[PDB]
Amino acid sequence: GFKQDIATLRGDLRTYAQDIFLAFLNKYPDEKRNFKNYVGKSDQELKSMAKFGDHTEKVFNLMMEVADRATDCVPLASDASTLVQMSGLTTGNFEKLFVALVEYMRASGQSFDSQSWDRFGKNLVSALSSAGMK
């Protein structure tokens, strides 16, 4: 289930981080509105851009840290606070990333606990809102 998933994602974090963030960008083409430098690039061309690999990996690492400290897929309010205080982002964009993550898990042949990820995303979004993210 959820804890084992974090370990599975950690064991190939750079490739899962890139492949899930590409699933997100291709499901929600308008989210490139927020990535001037990714517009007009295929998956292969993004995978050659240093900050593509290094940003996606840092984001998923942080998500894994928040997931690892969560109880029953509920993140720490402290963690939400820290995230909101870390330039312009929304709970809607986070929600979409999680929808992409869960669909990516469901289509894998691996026993990902996709329902726990869906609950975790819904609880992180609510935590961010409660901590003052628009």
Residues that bind ligand T6C (CB under 6 A): 21, 51-52, 55-56, 59
User: By CB under 6 A, what part of segment 37-76 binds ligand FDE?
Assistant: 55, 58-59, 62-63
Choosing among ligand FDE, ligand T6C, none, which partner's interface includes residue 56 (Cβ < 5 to 8 Å by kind)? ligand T6C
User: By CB under 6 A, what part of segment 74-93 binds ligand FDE?
Assistant: 83, 86, 89, 93
Please give the Cα distance from 128 to 7 (Å, whole number): 24
Choosing among ligand FDE, ligand T6C, none, which partner's interface includes residue 94 (Cβ < 5 to 8 Å by kind)? ligand FDE
Phi-psi region of 43 (alpha: psi -120 to 50; beta: other; left: phi over 0): alpha
**Distances from the Cα of 126 to the Cα of 39, 51, 66, 67, 130, angstroms:** 30, 29, 14, 14, 6
